[PDB]
Design a binder for these strands. Structure first.
Lengths: 97, 97
DNA sequence: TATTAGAGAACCCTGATGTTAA
DNA sequence: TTAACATCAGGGTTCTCTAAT
């Protein structure tokens, strides 16, 4: 028996989320943001990424609703309070010790 | 100030794994294979995939060592007994109910 | 059955241009 | 103007399907 289109739907969404997490630098980002608030520049020096590239990664994380922001003047502070991210990171830390 | 190259590597491996899982059809596949043994044809007909495409996806799953194979000479049976896969799927099913 | 090649799109960098607040 | 980010434009790389007269 073939799978019901709803299962396909679920798999599609889950895959979108996982894909948002399925990148090394993005993973480092989510780790760091889960543990603290950071300015984009500081993030750039923490994952060793350029401002443009990191801003794109952050945009893709925003696309999946994986990060939150607060504004102070010209500086934006990113953080992560996504249950999903913490669950996945938890599983990952259970796997690789 | 920046993350240690060791952390970069950890992130690389974890991201490689997640990338292996970050696909809808592949997710359905890993679900089905985690819960039972199946022949390639049956898999192809339950996830709504062609033989070639499914064979390619399974090739990628094998590349990350997320599945095992058994031969009945003309028929090959795929299965999954990776704790990591079950952890990620567990988290996913914890999220989306 | 697994392997190939190819089209079309998504990815992910660099570098330049936009947006927003002091 | 400067400062901190966002987004655009391009080009190389990677994905995932179909075709295999």
């Amino acid at each position: 028996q073939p799978l019901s289109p709803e299962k396909h739907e679920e798999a599609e969404i889950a895959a979108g989320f996982l894909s948002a997490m399925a990148n090394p630098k993005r993973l480092l980002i989510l780790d760091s943001l889960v543990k603290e608030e950071m300015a984009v520049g500081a993030l750039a020096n923490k994952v060793g990424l350029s401002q443009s590239a990191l801003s794109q990664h952050l945009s893709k994380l925003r696309a999946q609703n994986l990060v939150s922001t607060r504004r102070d003047a010209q500086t934006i502070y990113y953080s992560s309070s996504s249950d999903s991210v913490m669950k996945i990171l938890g599983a990952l830390s259970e796997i690789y010790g």
